[PDB]
Design a binder for this molecule. Structure first.
Ligand SMILES: O=C(O)c1cc(=O)c2ccc(Cl)cc2[nH]1
Ligand SMILES: O=C(O)c1cc(=O)c2ccc(Cl)cc2[nH]1
Ligand SMILES: O=C(O)c1cc(=O)c2ccc(Cl)cc2[nH]1
Ligand SMILES: [Cl-]
Length: 256
């Protein structure tokens, strides 16, 4: 029994280890190890392909979904292995396992800063900051900073910085671009805290520092087709990995 796995590249969750003839051959990462834990225990083999648009998946004008979620809806893949945020929107078109990673937001800073939190970052302007355009972080700051019900001045000030020149000045098109901008410029990059911790830990110049708060009731899960016969056993195994302390060994392999 061979499963077809769709993924989205995101260090250190899913990283392409080897390319042959212009296509990835081997994948590694925390999400890959969780997949390898499921495959060996439940007794299935798999093959992995990257989502063509490199997107996670969001609803479109016409109802259809794009990205990884779209690949599962159109049944072009059986399961999705990535840092895919569990949302009610997505739970309506694909089946999610239980959470295997906690959602977290953080900021990447040049070595030698006073910034301790996202709160601090919002209260200064000397270090410009931003994220990836139209990403999760971006859309959250935009929503909170434009919501008349919200009166947390942090999201209002952050959106003011992020949306300078309609977002062309302080944002980037890829996370790699944001990281290099911190490395070689005066900039702070807001992203998933777990990603940024991996980046900081592994930078050859050790030029980064990172702070971030985790977010409860938010996290990443494995996705499957709607009405998949594999969800329940997938979710059970994830619990088992958690109780046995196997998940904390995987997390320590990538976040020592
Ligand atoms: O699942 C999503 O929609 C999604 C959007 C992001 O910008 C993102 C960024 C970093 C990580 Cl580790 C996961 C992410 N997931
Ligand atoms: O602390 C939270 O609940 C939280 C959730 C987000 O999605 C988020 C996104 C961007 C920024 Cl700059 C802060 C954030 N904080
Ligand atoms: O792709 C971008 O928006 C971008 C902005 C920078 O300031 C920048 C600075 C250095 C490097 Cl190596 C890449 C960069 N990329
Ligand atoms: Cl395999």
């Amino acid at each position: 029994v061979v499963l077809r796995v769709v993924t989205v590249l995101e260090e250190p969750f899913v990283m392409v280890s080897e390319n042959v003839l212009g296509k990835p051959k081997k994948y590694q990462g925390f999400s890959i190890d969780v997949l390898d834990a499921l495959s060996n225990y439940l007794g299935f083999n798999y093959e992995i392909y990257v989502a063509p648009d490199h997107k996670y998946g969001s609803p479109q004008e016409d109802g259809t979904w794009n990205g990884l979620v779209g690949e599962l809806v159109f049944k072009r893949a059986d399961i999705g292995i990535s840092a895919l945020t569990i949302t009610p929107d997505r739970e309506n078109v694909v089946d999610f396992t239980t959470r295997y990673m906690d959602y977290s937001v953080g900021v990447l800073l040049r070595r030698g800063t006073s910034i301790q939190s996202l709160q601090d970052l919002s209260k200064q302007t000397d270090i410009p900051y931003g994220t990836v355009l139209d990403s999760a972080v971006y859309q959250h700051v935009r929503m909170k900073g434009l919501n008349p019900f919200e009166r947390d001045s942090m999201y209002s000030q952050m959106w003011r910085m992020i949306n300078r020149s309609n977002g062309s000045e302080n944002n980037v098109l890829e996370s790699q671009a944001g990281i290099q901008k911190v490395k070689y410029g005066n900039y702070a990059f807001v992203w998933d805290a777990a990603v940024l911790e991996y980046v900081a830990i592994n930078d050859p110049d050790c030029s980064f520092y990172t702070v971030g708060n985790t977010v409860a009731d938010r996290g990443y899960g494995i996705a499957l087709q709607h009405g998949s016969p594999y969800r329940d056993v997938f979710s059970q195994r994830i619990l088992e990995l958690q109780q046995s302390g196997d998940m904390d060994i995987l997390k320590h392999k990538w976040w020592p």
